[PDB]
């Protein structure tokens, strides 16, 4: 799947862990600007940005899972 | 300061809190790509991206503080 899709799925997953607003707001805004860049000025660099944001979302998911287990 | 500067400053602050690599490594990469975009294809959208990444880093700092205590 396209980098855009990997990023969208990963954000959707992150939202289900109810992360703090002070983290979720900027992540959502960053993802949103990445979508704008895919649409308006696509490139291999924007693709890498999207992969990096997907990975960030997934790392925040893993931290949440770890927190929940320790609880 | 420009969005490029605020993003880099906020990330430097974040590193001092030693967040988990599973979070820091992708933040560093996002910022890497953003820097490339500013340098090569600047725009109000790239600036906004930079601002968002600065805010992310400052949010992670705020959470780090809470966690540290």
Short mmCIF file of C-alpha atoms in Angstrom, two decimals:
data_model
loop_
_atom_site.label_atom_id
_atom_site.label_comp_id
_atom_site.label_asym_id
_atom_site.label_seq_id
_atom_site.Cartn_x
_atom_site.Cartn_y
_atom_site.Cartn_z
CA UNK A 1 0.00 0.00 0.00
CA UNK A 2 0.96 3.63 -0.71
CA UNK A 3 2.77 5.61 2.01
CA UNK A 4 -0.36 7.79 2.38
CA UNK A 5 -2.42 4.72 3.27
CA UNK A 6 0.14 3.38 5.76
CA UNK A 7 0.10 6.72 7.50
CA UNK A 8 -3.72 7.00 7.55
CA UNK A 9 -4.11 3.46 8.98
CA UNK A 10 -1.49 4.06 11.63
CA UNK A 11 -3.14 7.31 12.76
CA UNK A 12 -6.52 5.64 12.90
CA UNK A 13 -5.01 2.94 15.11
CA UNK A 14 -3.34 5.54 17.38
CA UNK A 15 -6.64 7.37 17.94
CA UNK A 16 -8.13 4.25 19.48
CA UNK A 17 -5.61 4.38 22.37
CA UNK A 18 -6.96 7.81 23.51
CA UNK A 19 -3.59 9.48 23.51
CA UNK A 20 -3.24 12.84 25.28
CA UNK A 21 -4.56 15.75 23.26
CA UNK A 22 -1.21 17.50 23.57
CA UNK A 23 0.25 14.69 21.50
CA UNK A 24 -2.66 13.81 19.28
CA UNK A 25 -3.40 17.32 18.07
CA UNK A 26 0.08 17.94 16.58
CA UNK A 27 0.25 14.38 15.17
CA UNK A 28 -3.09 14.87 13.48
CA UNK A 29 -2.08 18.26 12.16
CA UNK A 30 1.25 16.88 10.83
CA UNK A 31 -0.49 13.98 9.13
CA UNK A 32 -2.93 16.39 7.66
CA UNK A 33 -0.21 18.60 6.19
CA UNK A 34 1.43 15.46 4.79
CA UNK A 35 -1.79 14.60 3.01
CA UNK A 36 -1.80 18.12 1.53
CA UNK A 37 1.75 17.61 0.29
CA UNK A 38 0.92 14.20 -1.31
CA UNK A 39 -1.95 15.90 -3.12
CA UNK A 40 -0.23 19.10 -4.15
CA UNK A 41 3.50 18.46 -4.41
CA UNK A 42 4.17 14.69 -4.43
CA UNK A 43 7.73 13.35 -4.33
CA UNK A 44 9.91 10.65 -2.88
CA UNK A 45 10.60 13.01 0.06
CA UNK A 46 6.90 13.49 0.83
CA UNK A 47 6.57 9.68 0.60
CA UNK A 48 9.34 9.26 3.18
CA UNK A 49 7.65 11.86 5.38
CA UNK A 50 4.47 9.80 5.30
CA UNK A 51 6.36 6.61 6.19
CA UNK A 52 8.00 8.43 9.08
CA UNK A 53 4.67 9.65 10.42
CA UNK A 54 3.21 6.18 10.11
CA UNK A 55 6.13 4.87 12.13
CA UNK A 56 5.70 7.59 14.75
CA UNK A 57 2.03 6.66 15.16
CA UNK A 58 2.94 3.00 15.49
CA UNK A 59 5.61 3.77 18.08
CA UNK A 60 3.04 5.74 20.08
CA UNK A 61 0.72 2.72 19.80
CA UNK A 62 3.46 0.42 21.09
CA UNK A 63 4.16 2.73 24.01
CA UNK A 64 0.52 2.70 24.91
CA UNK A 65 0.39 -1.11 24.79
CA UNK A 66 3.44 -1.28 27.00
CA UNK A 67 1.80 1.17 29.46
CA UNK A 68 -1.40 -0.83 29.57
CA UNK A 69 0.53 -4.10 30.23
CA UNK A 70 2.60 -2.53 33.06
CA UNK A 71 -0.84 -1.49 34.45
CA UNK B 1 12.06 32.56 14.68
CA UNK B 2 11.08 30.72 11.48
CA UNK B 3 9.21 27.41 11.64
CA UNK B 4 12.37 25.60 10.56
CA UNK B 5 14.16 27.02 13.65
CA UNK B 6 11.34 26.30 16.09
CA UNK B 7 11.08 22.70 14.89
CA UNK B 8 14.80 22.15 15.43
CA UNK B 9 14.84 23.88 18.82
CA UNK B 10 11.88 21.88 20.07
CA UNK B 11 13.48 18.61 18.93
CA UNK B 12 16.71 19.49 20.70
CA UNK B 13 14.74 20.02 23.89
CA UNK B 14 12.98 16.71 23.43
CA UNK B 15 16.25 14.81 23.10
CA UNK B 16 17.24 15.91 26.58
CA UNK B 17 14.36 13.94 28.01
CA UNK B 18 15.66 10.67 26.47
CA UNK B 19 12.37 9.49 25.03
CA UNK B 20 12.15 5.92 23.86
CA UNK B 21 13.87 5.30 20.53
CA UNK B 22 10.63 3.84 19.21
CA UNK B 23 9.24 7.39 19.36
CA UNK B 24 12.43 9.44 18.83
CA UNK B 25 13.73 7.66 15.76
CA UNK B 26 10.60 8.43 13.67
CA UNK B 27 10.36 11.98 15.01
CA UNK B 28 13.94 12.53 13.85
CA UNK B 29 13.11 11.13 10.45
CA UNK B 30 9.99 13.28 10.09
CA UNK B 31 12.02 16.31 10.93
CA UNK B 32 14.74 15.20 8.48
CA UNK B 33 12.18 15.11 5.68
CA UNK B 34 10.67 18.39 6.72
CA UNK B 35 14.10 20.05 6.62
CA UNK B 36 14.57 18.75 3.10
CA UNK B 37 11.23 20.14 2.09
CA UNK B 38 12.00 23.60 3.50
CA UNK B 39 15.29 23.71 1.70
CA UNK B 40 14.02 22.40 -1.63
CA UNK B 41 10.28 22.98 -1.98
CA UNK B 42 9.36 25.61 0.53
CA UNK B 43 5.71 26.67 0.97
CA UNK B 44 3.17 27.76 3.57
CA UNK B 45 2.23 24.03 3.80
CA UNK B 46 5.83 23.04 4.56
CA UNK B 47 5.98 25.82 7.13
CA UNK B 48 2.81 24.56 8.74
CA UNK B 49 4.25 21.06 8.80
CA UNK B 50 7.30 22.38 10.60
CA UNK B 51 5.11 24.16 13.14
CA UNK B 52 3.18 20.94 13.70
CA UNK B 53 6.38 18.99 14.29
CA UNK B 54 7.60 21.64 16.70
CA UNK B 55 4.32 21.37 18.58
CA UNK B 56 4.65 17.58 18.62
CA UNK B 57 8.06 17.76 20.14
CA UNK B 58 6.89 20.27 22.78
CA UNK B 59 3.97 18.05 23.55
CA UNK B 60 6.27 15.10 24.04
CA UNK B 61 8.39 17.31 26.38
CA UNK B 62 5.28 18.20 28.43
CA UNK B 63 4.44 14.49 28.72
CA UNK B 64 8.02 13.63 29.60
CA UNK B 65 7.99 16.05 32.44
CA UNK B 66 4.87 14.44 33.89
CA UNK B 67 6.41 11.01 33.41
CA UNK B 68 9.71 11.94 34.97
CA UNK B 69 8.09 13.18 38.16
#
